């Protein structure tokens, strides 16, 4: 109870990878022909993050070393990593012999499995009320060096007989040595601005295909596969797990709402290595050359969570309730207005939680300035250092009195109305107990459909407890009203009502008719009926995610990632 | 008592290895002839795992740093390793001189003992309710480097006399140095997906037979055995012991059942090294060449354990019972329905265990929401923060009272019926004591017959307390009903009854008539009678495992590893 | 008293080495001639082991991290090593000049002292109820590497005058560097199976005689001794002391008996280095060559100890007794049947020891299920959680009462019969005290005669408190009956009676008439009379060990190491 409260909850990311999404050309000089095939087997992405929410100092403590602030913590370290990210198990390759004319040109192609060029993790903040405080990879590594200078001379004399000869050798020399060390996948932090920080694990050694060669050339006849795999670490292709922390600083006493967006991604690149029939004086030897122009395809996934700066997590002290002991289940519930009511108790009721301070007062978690005073118990007042605000717990008893008069706090038998009385009467009881309660559980995580890019649009759910869709072959705009449709305008409006829908089936991907956006929205009721809007035939690289709710759930507001032309992503802010 | 409970139990793997299973061809170019022989002596596999089951936080504690979760721990580290895995003691070899025509071809063969190519350990989860949280070999090793650049020049002058000469030497030089380190058997973790993680210890240096040569060639007459053994570590062939941890994360409050499958394996590869009669200008010299096309044979074994997410292990607190002290042996036993009965006490009775909380209530391990309240003691209710639910232990006494009224909890002399009374009467007693009891012992481990591969079929035991078999020369399908036979269908159905069978003799192996599957099922009763179904004559590489039970045991359900065509494995879920 | 009990006792090995056993040929090419001589002086073997017996957790504690188990610990580390193993002090050698024809052949021999090729320590288990849990040399050392790649070029120009010349030099270079480290005597653990683990310290560098050469050759006349000793560590020949641990895991609650066998050994090899008169164009130079075909002779010794899984060591708690205070010396002694008797007290009486538990009961060390209850004190019952089983120690008194009734436990003045009474009477006393007693001393170690190899035969001592011998020139079989003679059958049976024999003189060694087995059995009585059976004339390399007992000792059973043809070893299981 004396320690520092925190809030933690695991947030998960899972994303099946289609073999189709891993299909690219079987050659580079011959990309037009030779067809296609999948470049990886059973690719999968599955990481688990750690989330912590804490204030920097206990409530009431003044002038400690740590400045008062609000902290959001996102960590991936030894105690929590997840499963990893996977692309393959082996290293497949095939031969491609010369088909066109062979006079002086490229005539052989060796395509292999794809090694991840770089893993990218990008964080972001919805607005600027958040700040970046600490980053565990404190910054790019500053590498020591070793420079070595060597200067010398040679003085030699030689005498010989055959004929007799005598000569003297005199020489000077100079050389400078430079050396350093380099990580294979070196950390590279990128701080775009004060509200978004991005990490990047990137190749430094053996980065290009050119460096995978163990041989320069051969004779005009040798046919062997020299693209080594012993120089390729299984870290690169088989599996990998990250390690990084980013921690967010917020304003001192700011009240509002904010969204943080975690995006994890992996970049995939096949390797295309061929030989040119260099006909030099030595002969038509096959010097080998890598193809760095080979395309790279980015695969991403997202997750989100909404933090409320008014949440009792940031008060800095474990809250308590007040069970009115005259009844079996009654507690002092306070509205936003200020009045109070005795109702059923709940361990998750923020409007019921309270804080005990150094000055013997009581503070509700609704606002730090909301405090209980005795001159008029009916409602709470903006509080100060009044003597009537201080309360004392008499030892070994259940009578919480005050300091101004010493009279105990008591409540009525039938209505529980609370007042100050010196001694209990027939119709007024004094007993009152309390205990710490969990007001620290996390709100349910709501996954994202589509692609969290572009400016985010925040609009509340409309009058019909649903939204409006302006869609055609491709989605154009979303919103809770006709004018509130952000994005395109070519799609016809549809006023859908969703009060009583079990789930939504949304199919996204590289939409062939245009862009790479979720276009298909199939809504699944409790019985299982389906209503689909969008084009499920003109879609390529389709990825689908399922989004479930309890039936008859009143959605609160919406999140719409979008550019100035179309909707890029959609999120349902649930209860 | 104040510490964090855990559950631990050793799970063992043992597997005799036949010399027949270690038989391969005596040559590679001459594999057809020269017969066969065993490639290892007295091979054996024996490892011991460590199993831990624990929740992340004590029950009732709120908002600590560690998020609430469910953890399954599998470890192989310093404190528990087992015996090891063995393949040989020495390094046998024999000469094979030229037999065919010797003009220009391979003419000598030197076959030796087999060194384990790689040790593979694969874990798996039955369903997706489990997740991968931490892996002790945190990931593939990222190796530092040392790149060194050297550029220099030479300026020299030489004067001589014979005749007089004077010359000046001028030269430039450039060189780049690269170096790194490499483990012989480097760790290589492979994360197939979010529910199964696989480790692999694999050769990096001296991996191929080509690297075992200490000589390039000799004259046209030299006959010596150069395949060195000093470059082969006894780690590789003599003995080995693993080190690795994998730990499983489960959902917050998920209820159900799940199966984890441990598979340990060793891959065996003989080495075939020969010489080609390269007739160059120097002569017919015997350059040596390794044979990497030599087959590898995988040998495996399995073990399993079934965890119950409802087990009192995951409550997070040491349970207690309530011995009704009026009788010598009576405790408050609660059914799943909610009613209670006073019966014989048992230290292993989950339906008898209870939990003491911060709020002075009592929680049964059957469900965290099942709590005892005083308004109607006859049955438990879905509990909340009611005052009538809180109980206090009066100091130095045996009268557990309540807080709502202060009356003690008492029970009747003849039936033990419990009620709330201010003072004990002639027919009602008040004394009640308690103590911590071991409800943490593990369920008996049930080994596996066959090969745990393919999708796993979970079907309950049929009406006759047994299963049905559709078998012929080779097993086709298993199940508890004719329609519930998963796998093939060519075998005739057999309705076997097994209530009162001591043991089952199941002979598996590389079934020559088809596949590598358990086909022979010999059932051994208490007297020792045998009933065999399957083909014991068309089986090769036969491995048998014995499975024992107490007589007259009612098996609960079945586990059937299988593909879409046949049964791959069978498991009996016992009492 | 709060700590974890263990049992420890030193077990010693000593073995005199005869100079005869260290005799081998004075040459290798000339082994037939030149006679023989001893190859070491005053060789001796003397090591001391450490033995620990402990359970993994205190009795009654539930669900701790450490799984419940049974552990046998054998250690050789810093705190206990013994004296060592010795072979010599100096390095003797002698010249052997050419005697046969000297045209083109070996013509010189330099035999020296023997350096131990390898020290071998092999452990074993009688049956499979034991398992291997941890080994301190966790496994073979996995050695790091350093691979270094260097590629460069040379571009030089030289101008000179005599005549004027101008030339340009252009060259490329490539080189790969490999390096590692190697122990001289590298650890090499060998895990034969799940019940026996064997260590081996073996030469890696300077292993063969070929590597002891400091010179390649000389002229046709040089005569010098180049077999260096500075490259031979005194670790190898002078003295050595081991370091290793092996620890045994047993079943959870298995009851029975088991034998562990420690065997320590040293392998001895002389070195034979000669020169061949290689007559090349340079001349008849003497290139030197080691002789790796020189025989090696293994010398061993054994010791044993028998552990009883029912021993109070594995209960996990320090036992106590109960001295009935009415008499001066009476304690509650319980038979195996269950009844009790008041007899003389002993601190070593397992049938008298008892355990105090968390639940206030008493458990006898005979069986964990044997507990004392008050409804019928006359005998112990299979115990459970009954209230009548719980006992309390009243503060500052000597009256151990019960919880069911509160009446004290009391005993009668003349017979000590125990009962439950509220108040003491004239003929019944209540006082009862207790104290911890040493029930942890070790059983007397019984050394072994012969050679502990082959399957071990366990047969109880026959009807005549002795055994039967079927012996002739060489021993054939041993047993307690004519049919129970395991081994050969050519020897005539002898029914010897041994009740009242002080000691046995058994002379073993490399029996020339056949094998290497103990054949001579001389039995020494208290007076010193001798009765010898066997051949003391056809024995070579004779080693004798003396085995002493108190007179008139009833031996219990026998241990007979043997193969399928003859007896290999004999052990007398004493009182």
Chain centroid, CA B107 distance in Å: 46
Contact C266, C295 (CB under 8 A): no
| Closest chain B CA to residue A158 | B160
Residue C67: how many CB atoms within 10 A of its CB? Answer: 19
What is the phi/psi pair of residue B138, to 5°? -45, -35
Distances in Å between the alpha carbon of C324 and those of A497, C330, C384, C408, C429?
88, 5, 26, 14, 9
Contact A333, A342 (CB under 8 A): yes
Per DSSP, the residues of B475-500 read EEEEESSSTT-EE---SEEEE---TT
| Closest chain A CA to residue B133 | A82
- The first and second tokens of residue C285, run together, are 């130079």
The candidate with the shortest Cα–Cα distance to B385, out of B361, B410, B409, is: B361
CA dihedral C185, C189, C190, C195 (to 10 degrees): 140
Q: Chain B: nearest CA to C163, how far in angstroms?
A: 9
User: What letter would DSSP give residue A150?
Assistant: E
Contact B542, B508 (CB under 8 A): yes
Closest by Cβ to A166, choosing from B152, B161, B358: B161
d(CA C96, CA C466): 56
d(CA C395, CA A217): 94
- The first and second tokens of residue C404, run together, are 């069911």
- The first and second tokens of residue B244, run together, are 């690795």
Please enumerate in sequence order all residues whose Cβ is within 8 A of that of B337, keeping only pairs 6 or more positions apart, or say none: B379
d(CA A76, CA A59): 29
Q: Which residue has the tokens 């760790």?
A: B187
Q: Which long-range contacts (CB under 8 A, 24 or more apart) does C180-187 make?
A: C180/C143, C180/C144, C180/C145, C180/C146, C181/C143, C182/C143, C183/C141, C184/C233, C184/C235, C184/C236, C185/C235, C185/C236, C186/C141, C187/C137, C187/C140, C187/C141
| C141 Cβ under 8 Å from any chain B Cβ | yes
Please enumerate in sequence order all residues whose Cβ is within 8 A of that of A299, keeping only pairs 6 or more positions apart, or say none: A15, A17, A21, A45, A265, A266, A267, A268
- The first and second tokens of residue C228, run together, are 């260096």
Residue B442: how many CB atoms within 10 A of its CB? Answer: 17
Contact A251, A70 (CB under 8 A): yes
Contact A333, A346 (CB under 8 A): no
The SS3 call for residue C387 is: helix
Mutation for B interface: C137, C140, C373, C374, most B CBs within 10 A = C140
> What is the helix (H) or strand (E) element at residue C507, kind and residue range?
strand C503-511
Please enumerate in sequence order all residues whose Cβ is within 8 A of that of C300, keeping only pairs 6 or more positions apart, or say none: C263, C264, C265, C451
d(CA B59, CA C289): 76
The SS3 call for residue B66 is: coil
**A 236-255 → B contacts, CB under 8 A:** 238-241, 243
Q: How would you classify residue C48: left for phi > 0, otherwise alpha for psi between -120 and 50, otherwise beta?
A: beta
Helices vs. strands in chain C: H and E counts, helices first: 1, 47
| Closest chain B CA to residue A187 | B142
Please enumerate in sequence order all residues whose Cβ is within 8 A of that of B395, keeping only pairs 6 or more positions apart, or say none: none
- The first and second tokens of residue C323, run together, are 């001295």
Please enumerate in sequence order all residues whose Cβ is within 8 A of that of B264, keeping only pairs 6 or more positions apart, or say none: B13, B45, B47, B85, B121, B300, B301
- List the beta bridge partners of residue C479: C468
d(CA A115, CA A236): 6
Closest by Cβ to B9, choosing from C67, C190, C191: C67
Largest CA distance in chain B: 140
Resolution (A): 3.8
Please enumerate in sequence order all residues whose Cβ is within 8 A of that of A504, keeping only pairs 6 or more positions apart, or say none: A449, A521, A522, A523, A524, A547, A572
What is the sign, positive or negative, of the torsion defined by CA atoms of C334, C335, C340, C344?
A: negative
Binary contact (B238, C188; C-beta < 8 A): yes
In angstroms, what is the C-alpha Rg of chain A?
35
- The first and second tokens of residue B270, run together, are 């003989």
Q: How would you classify residue B455: left for phi > 0, otherwise alpha for psi between -120 and 50, otherwise beta?
A: beta
The candidate with the shortest Cα–Cα distance to C541, out of C510, C505, C507, is: C510
- Residue B271, judged by CB atoms within 10 A of its CB (0-12, 13-18, 19+), counts as buried
| A166 Cβ under 8 Å from any chain B Cβ | yes
Per DSSP, the residues of C390-443 read -EEE-TTSS-EEESSS-PEEEEETTT--EEEESS--SSEE--EE--B----PPP
Contact C532, C539 (CB under 8 A): no
Contact C286, C303 (CB under 8 A): no
Binary contact (B10, C69; C-beta < 8 A): yes
- List the beta bridge partners of residue A298: A267
Binary contact (C193, B83; C-beta < 8 A): yes
Distances in Å between the alpha carbon of B286 and those of A274, B98, B219, C328?
33, 13, 8, 94
The candidate with the shortest Cα–Cα distance to B478, out of B375, B566, B351, is: B566
Q: Chain B: nearest CA to A311, how far in angstroms?
A: 13
d(CA B192, CA A41): 10
Q: Which residue has the tokens 């450039």?
A: B174
The candidate with the shortest Cα–Cα distance to B62, out of B337, B361, B352, B316, is: B316
Residue A48: how many CB atoms within 10 A of its CB? Answer: 20
Q: Which residue has the tokens 């610990």?
A: C73
d(CA B12, CA B111): 35
The candidate with the shortest Cα–Cα distance to B89, out of C144, C72, C303, C118, is: C118
The SS3 call for residue A209 is: helix
The candidate with the shortest Cα–Cα distance to C88, out of C270, C227, C252, is: C270
For B105-136, what is the HEC assignment? CEEEEEEECCEEEEEEEEEEECCCCEEEEEEC
Residues of C in contact with B85 (CB under 8 A): 191
Q: Chain B: nearest CA to A13, how far in angstroms?
A: 10
d(CA B511, CA B535): 9
Q: Chain B: nearest CA to A292, how far in angstroms?
A: 23
d(CA A305, CA A262): 9
Per DSSP, the residues of B400-469 read EEESSS-PEEEEETTT--EEEESS--SSEE--EE--B----PPPPP---EE---SEEEEEE--TTSS-EE
**A 53-72 → B contacts, CB under 8 A:** none
Binary contact (C151, B176; C-beta < 8 A): yes
In angstroms, the first-to-last Cα distance of chain A is: 31
Side-chain-side CA neighbours of residue B415 (13 Å) = 5
- The first and second tokens of residue C295, run together, are 């025989």
Residues of B in contact with C194 (CB under 8 A): 14, 44, 46, 82-83
What is the sign, positive or negative, of the torsion defined by CA atoms of C169, C170, C176, C177?
A: positive
- The first and second tokens of residue C351, run together, are 């049938």
d(CA C319, CA C353): 6
Binary contact (B155, A171; C-beta < 8 A): yes
d(CA B559, CA B450): 12
Q: SS3 helix, strand, coil % of chain A, rounded to 5?
A: 5, 50, 50
d(CA B476, CA B479): 11
The candidate with the shortest Cα–Cα distance to B318, out of B60, B11, B72, is: B60
d(CA A297, CA A224): 30
| C165 Cβ under 8 Å from any chain B Cβ | yes
Closest by Cβ to C156, choosing from B84, B163, B171: B171
Contact C306, C272 (CB under 8 A): no
| B235 Cβ under 8 Å from any chain C Cβ | yes
Residues of A in contact with B188 (CB under 8 A): 234, 238
Contact A473, A538 (CB under 8 A): yes
The candidate with the shortest Cα–Cα distance to B514, out of B478, B456, B484, B472, is: B472
| Cβ pairs A/B, distance under 8 A | 196
d(CA B18, CA A228): 37
Q: Are strands A36-38 and A93-96 parallel, antiparallel or unpaired?
A: unpaired
d(CA A383, CA A380): 8
d(CA B343, CA B327): 10
C-alpha triplet B204, B208, B209: angle, nearest 5°: 145
Contact B389, B380 (CB under 8 A): no
d(CA B389, CA B368): 14
d(CA B45, CA B84): 7
- The first and second tokens of residue A24, run together, are 């690219």
Residues of B in contact with C184 (CB under 8 A): none
d(CA A311, CA B63): 13
Q: Which residue has the tokens 């460069």?
A: C152
**B 412-441 → A contacts, CB under 8 A:** none
Per DSSP, the residues of C463-486 read TTSS-EEEESSSEEEEESSSTT-E
- The first and second tokens of residue C331, run together, are 């304690």
For A99-114, what is the HEC assignment? CCCCCCCEEEEEEECC
d(CA B167, CA B389): 108
Chain centroid, CA A119 distance in Å: 14
Per DSSP, the residues of A366-383 read T-TTEE--SS-TTB-EE-
d(CA A411, CA A418): 4
Residues of B in contact with C188 (CB under 8 A): 234, 238
Residue numbers after which chain A is interrupted (C to N above 2.5 A) read 162
Q: Give the number of residues written for chain B.
A: 575
- Residue A393, judged by CB atoms within 10 A of its CB (0-12, 13-18, 19+), counts as middle
Buried b (16+ CB within 10 A) or exposed e, C87-115: bbeebeeeebeeeeeeeeebbbbbbbbbb
d(CA A70, CA A250): 5
Contact C108, C97 (CB under 8 A): yes
- The first and second tokens of residue B245, run together, are 């941890």
The candidate with the shortest Cα–Cα distance to C504, out of C561, C544, C455, C464, is: C544
Residues of B in contact with A81 (CB under 8 A): 133-135, 138
Closest by Cβ to C192, choosing from B42, B80, B241: B42
The candidate with the shortest Cα–Cα distance to C475, out of C524, C546, C522, C533, is: C533
The candidate with the shortest Cα–Cα distance to B175, out of A480, C14, C152, A249, is: C152
- List the beta bridge partners of residue B193: B196
Distances in Å between the alpha carbon of B424 and those of B274, B280, B400, C61, C425?
96, 111, 13, 36, 33
Largest CA distance in chain A: 140
Mutation for A interface: B159, B181, B387, B388, most A CBs within 10 A = B387
d(CA B13, CA B9): 13
- List the beta bridge partners of residue A187: A201
Strand order in the sheet with A93-96: A93-96, A106-112, A272-279, A284-290
Distances in Å between the alpha carbon of A71 and those of A121, A239, A398, A486, C492?
20, 32, 37, 32, 93
Contact A369, A384 (CB under 8 A): no
Residues of B in contact with C145 (CB under 8 A): 181-184, 205
Please enumerate in sequence order all residues whose Cβ is within 8 A of that of A101, keeping only pairs 6 or more positions apart, or say none: none
d(CA C200, CA C185): 9
The candidate with the shortest Cα–Cα distance to A568, out of A474, A462, A466, A444, is: A474
Q: Chain B: nearest CA to A52, how far in angstroms?
A: 8
> What is the helix (H) or strand (E) element at residue A234, kind and residue range?
helix A234-237
d(CA B408, CA B399): 6
Closest by Cβ to B235, choosing from C62, C139, C169: C139
What is the sign, positive or negative, of the torsion defined by CA atoms of A58, A60, A66, A72?
A: positive
- The first and second tokens of residue C83, run together, are 């004296």
Q: Chain B: nearest CA to A206, how far in angstroms?
A: 12
| Cβ pairs B/C, distance under 8 A | 200
For C216-236, what is the HEC assignment? CCCCCCCCCCCECCCCCCHHH
Q: What was the elucidation method? A: cryo-EM
> What is the helix (H) or strand (E) element at residue B74, kind and residue range?
strand B70-76
d(CA A456, CA A260): 11
Binary contact (B6, C63; C-beta < 8 A): yes
In angstroms, what is the C-alpha Rg of chain B?
35
Residue B382: how many CB atoms within 10 A of its CB? Answer: 10
| A145 Cβ under 8 Å from any chain B Cβ | no
The candidate with the shortest Cα–Cα distance to C445, out of C549, C332, C327, C295, is: C549
Binary contact (B139, A235; C-beta < 8 A): yes
């Amino acid at each position: 109870t004396n320690t520092l409260p925190h809030v933690a909850f695991y947030i998960s990311v899972n994303r099946a990878i289609s073999d189709e999404e891993c299909t690219f050309n079987n050659s580079w000089l011959w990309k037009n022909e030779k067809g296609s095939r999948p470049f990886c087997k059973d690719a999968n992405i599955s990481l688990i993050y750690r989330v912590n929410l804490e204030r920097s100092l206990q409530y009431g403590i003044v002038g400690s070393a740590a400045p008062d602030a609000k902290i959001v913590r996102i960590s991936l370290d030894d105690d929590s990593t997840g499963a990893g990210i996977h692309l393959n198990d082996q290293l497949g390759y095939r031969q491609f012999g010369a088909s066109y004319t062979t006079l002086d040109a490229y005539f052989r192609e060796w395509s292999t499995d794809a090694i991840a060029q770089d893993y990218r993790f990008v964080f972001n903040a919805s607005n600027n009320k958040a700040q970046i405080l600490k980053t565990f990879p404190v910054d790019n590594i500053n590498e020591k060096f070793e420079r070595k200078e060597v200067s010398g001379f040679a003085l030699g004399v030689t005498g010989g007989v055959e004929k007799a000869k005598l000569e003297a050798r005199a020489s000077y020399t100079q050389s400078r040595w430079l050396t350093y060390n380099t990580q294979d996948y070196r950390i590279e932090r990128n701080a775009k601005n004060a509200q978004a920080v991005s990490f990047t694990w990137n190749r430094q050694q053996y980065a290009t295909a050119e460096s995978l060669l163990n041989r320069s050339t051969d004779a005009l006849w040798v046919n062997t596969y020299p693209v080594d795999v012993n120089r390729i670490s299984p870290l690169s292709y088989a599996s990998f797990v990250p390690k990084m922390d980013v921690i967010y600083k917020a304003s001192a006493t700011e009240t509002g709402s904010t969204d943080f967006i975690i995006d994890s991604s992996v970049n995939i690149r096949p390797i295309y290595n061929g030989a040119y029939k260099h006909y030099y004086v030595v002969g038509a030897h096959q010097f080998y050359h890598g193809f760095e122009d080979t395309p790279r395809r980015r695969i991403t996934k997202s997750a989100s969570f909404t933090v409320d700066w008014d949440h009792p997590v940031f008060t800095g002290g474990r809250p308590v309730n007040l069970q009115l002991a005259s009844f079996n289940n009654r507690c002092i519930q306070v509205d936003a207005q200020g009045r109070l009511a005795a109702n059923t108790c709940d361990s998750q009721q923020s409007a019921q939680s309270f804080i005990y301070d150094q000055l013997g007062r009581y503070v509700s978690a609704s606002n730090t300035k909301l405090c209980l005073d005795g001159e008029a118990l009916d409602a709470l007042q903006p509080c100060n250092q009044n003597l009537t605000q201080r309360w004392e717990w008499r030892k070994g008893t259940d009578e919480l009195t005050n300091v101004y008069s010493g009279e105990s706090l008591g409540h009525d038998k039938q209505t529980g109305e609370l007042g100050l009385y010196a001694s209990s009467n027939d119709a007024v009881s004094l007993r009152t107990i309390t205990a710490y309660t969990d007001v620290f559980n996390a709100q349910e995580s709501s996954p994202i459909l589509g692609y969290t890019q572009g400016k985010m649009n925040q609009q509340r759910v409309g009058q019909d407890h649903r939204l409006y869709v302006r869609a055609g072959a491709a989605i154009d705009a979303l919103g809770s009203a006709s004018d509130l449709l952000v994005g395109g305008n070519g799609g016809s409006l549809s006023s859908v009502d969703l009060s009583g829908v079990k789930s939504i089936t949304a199919t996204s991907g590289d939409f062939q008719y245009g862009g790479q956006q979720l276009v298909a929205l199939t809504f699944t009721y409790q019985d299982g009926r389906q209503q689909t809007v969008g084009s499920k035939a003109y879609v390529t690289n389709a990825h689908e995610d399922r989004f479930d709710l309890p039936a008859a759930a009143k959605i609160t507001q919406l999140k719409i990632w979008s550019d100035d032309w179309l909707v890029k992503g959609v999120q349902f802010d649930l209860n």
